[PDB]
Design a protein around this ligand. Structure first.
Ligand code: PAB
Ligand code: PAB
Ligand code: PAB
Ligand code: PAB
Ligand code: PAB
Ligand code: PAB
Ligand code: PAB
Ligand code: PAB
Lengths: 264, 273, 259, 269
């Protein structure tokens, strides 16, 4: 009826069409002052490439170590871009410190299952992404689509009962290593069924192993074409946020699709 | 049940969209001519496109881009024939020749080509007789020329292609050897190109395979804001995936590996009940 | 600097000028040969050629040579403003080509064909005298001697010295080593009071120096040879690769213009 | 003839040598949909080695007009994997194009044998790094209007030779580069090439780099960099004729062919 309007601490994200969330990782890789400077420059590049929002993450660690990584990046990007900023964390104290520093959204891989996380997000009144998460083999699911659906309903309801408004919830089926290639494809094929839980859906298949397995592409930067295709397919199947590394390419694909879809 | 195209003995099965790699044989397509021949650069490029997973290669020696100078037949032959001769010996792929000249169609097929991609839809005198004699598949493209305004571009392209299918059948060309192409970019504005892509299912209902070619075209540049053709890859791959979703069975592309990857992810998703 | 009046089309040799090669000879792929040659000549004009050299022999009888070169000359004289040269050693072809619009004659035989001296004297167009003879004791001295003899014979036939050019004849009449000798010693041939034409385009000797077997693989080495020839005094360069040669000469002219 | 010890790989400057340009930037390649930036750069370096390059120059930060600065962690993530792969797969000497001391040390540990510095060691720690590292180093000139561009570039290049001098930077490791394209107009670039023998009279090998540069485009009317090859090869041959012993180029095979013809002619008494 009404397109979702997300107030990310004053920076508005309108989901009248799929929006692109650019990935900004702040994790030392032995190549952290130099890590912070590189993360900020990367966020500015993704903003130039047309990102609708940036997702800043400092994990792959104690709260104080996560804060030393993400807080300087948030403070600099809040000052140097106009984009909504999301922070990737499952720890409530990081959620509170990040929002105080300027973050406007929380992307939580644990779907607020960390003790205190429900109360933090209810207090902070920012949007939150609830992800499904259950290396070696992925777990076996009898019906991955039904299981992810059941889990996300439970987490949506727990968040509402903790006082988090439904209009601030997003869900993410958790494409990636908690699923086999076949289960990731099932979740993508049946994504419209998860879009009917009354909340916007985020899809993040960027450079993931399943894309590599489908296309025979061993390294993450070789998986760009397949990832852009997966994200276009997810948007066609109802996803409203796409979490990507390759921002300019994804924006281009979505723009061509939007022009075609606009024809009656 | 799926169309099987016999391209001079090399079989192309259109049970899913197939990727036609563009092999341009023009001195201007390459910057290494200081120490390379035009033929050898085109052959090396075709071999790379075969390695990237092309299902067929389209070899052309005459540019039909806006503002091109016509290439005389003797020069067109000097470009395409040596490239076909080398690629037929070095690939197992069906090979198409992109030409509107019957003399080149006949010489190219004698050299090993198994398909003709004709931007003039066999309107050059002798082209119908050649294709009927040669018994290879042929792509009939729409173009007004050789930037007009249309009252209804989708209906006008449809009407033209119906007429050319009919002309080809009445010349003795088997209907099972026919393919059609709406001719994205040829005498069409960005808006007309988007209209033709959106309404592409309407052209797939003529019972013949449809080829779509939007690779790095000016319209993709306008839609995405990418001024240089090499910057248009992502937008081109998206356009070709959309065309395949709308019924196109052949995709004529420069960026073969990327297009193959996109189609492969889509095929995996489509294969889920 | 030499001012060459090519049948009304003036070529000023204050710096090296580029002569684009327009071959009209049938190959593995008549009317279609003429159409391709005209198109090629127009392309070389667009690429910056200062003049075009039209040739219908690479044995071809006069009547056959005329069927090749005359239609090409007639079409190019109408569609370009460039001076046009005809590459022939046969006096009857020289006369017909000039009547059709040619403004210069490039003669591999240096007017040694019976009748050639009187034809060119009658026509009042410029002529390039090439050396064609193989082993030499002193190739540079032998070429010099031959070209002096031919310049003098042309003057004694009534061809004004201001219409003469010479060409050492790089190419198959010399070994790679002898071609390199003539290039190194080219300034010595520039002291005969007449402009020198150098033509090393895609020749076997460049290919042998660089290990490039096919003619289009020899382009970089050919452009380099022509820049060296221009540095050593050549005022006309006969080339296939017009745009590339024009580019190299343009960069050299910018550098040479600095005191 | 000068012999450069690039970490065991000897570069003998008995004739002009060709330095092939290996840029490690996502913008330098179009096949990124299915290739990594590193793998495309390594493949390119191997192609330039096959075309006859005498050394490869690996760079991960573009200093062209208006480029955004590249963070050290990102510069390292680009150049180090390319150096590591090329040291294993070619026997050619490898140079790193960087002005950052941290990248110089990491690059040499990964296998680089030479450093090409556009800021002529004006970066704090670079002089100390170069003096510490003791690999050959190219000292380039970079600053716009000049009163006399050749003398001013000459003066600056003298001061940097003097500034470099007496840190343990042996004068036998110094190379200079007048820096075509960096803060110089077409006219100023033509001036420096014409008068290049005057900079060759300092006793250190000289590197010339005009490959596909904007000045070449302006002189020849070639708008796209890939259309500038012929003019670039001519410029590098003029530079070799005027004393340059290193030529930094994109078009290796063409430059090698031009040098091969000139060497055959120059060899005639
Ligand atoms: N100047 C640059 C800044 C950032 C990046 C990057 O994040 O990849 C690359 C270059
Ligand atoms: N494509 C070309 C490359 C190089 C040259 C040249 O060296 O003059 C010319 C053309
Ligand atoms: N040796 C090669 C040269 C060129 C190509 C290509 O054009 O893709 C591939 C291989
Ligand atoms: N052959 C063609 C090539 C390109 C275009 C275009 O860019 O619109 C159209 C036709
Ligand atoms: N359109 C043309 C392109 C090329 C040529 C040529 O190579 O002579 C002629 C015409
Ligand atoms: N460089 C690129 C090439 C291809 C794609 C894509 O297919 O989306 C994206 C980027
Ligand atoms: N195999 C090759 C890979 C890459 C290149 C190149 O980038 O020039 C050339 C050859
Ligand atoms: N690093 C540089 C690259 C290019 C140019 C130029 O084109 O002038 C200058 C410097």
């Amino acid at each position: 009826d009404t397109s979702p309007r997300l107030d990310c601490a004053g920076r508005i994200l309108t989901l009248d069409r799929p929006r692109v969330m650019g990935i900004v990782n702040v994790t030392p890789d032995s190549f952290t002052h130099t890590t912070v400077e590189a993360a900020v420059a990367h966020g500015l590049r993704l903003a130039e490439e047309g990102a609708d929002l940036l997702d800043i993450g400092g994990e792959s660690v104690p709260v104080e170590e996560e804060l030393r990584r993400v807080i300087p990046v948030i403070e600099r990007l809040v000052a140097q871009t106009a984009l909504p900023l999301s922070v990737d964390t499952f720890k409530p104290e990081v959620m509170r410190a990040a929002v105080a520093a300027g973050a406007g959204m929380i992307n939580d891989v644990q779907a607020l299952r960390q003790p205190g996380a429900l109360d933090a997000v209810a207090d902070l009144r920012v949007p939150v992404v609830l992800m499904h998460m259950p290396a070696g083999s992925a777990p076996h699911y009898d019906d991955v689509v039904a299981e992810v659906h059941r889990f996300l309903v439970e987490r949506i309801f727990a968040a509402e009962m903790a006082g988090i408004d439904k209009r601030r919830l997003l869900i993410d089926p958790g494409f990636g290593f908690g699923k086999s290639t076949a289960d990731n494809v099932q979740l993508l094929a049946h994504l419209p069924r998860l879009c009917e839980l009354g909340v916007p859906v985020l899809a993040g298949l960027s450079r993931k192993r399943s894309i590599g397995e489908l296309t025979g592409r061993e390294l993450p930067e070789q998986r760009v074409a397949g990832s852009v295709a997966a994200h276009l397919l997810a948007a066609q199947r109802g996803a409203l946020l796409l979490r990507v590394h390759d921002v300019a390419a994804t924006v281009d694909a979505l723009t061509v699709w939007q022009a075609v879809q606009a024809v009656p």
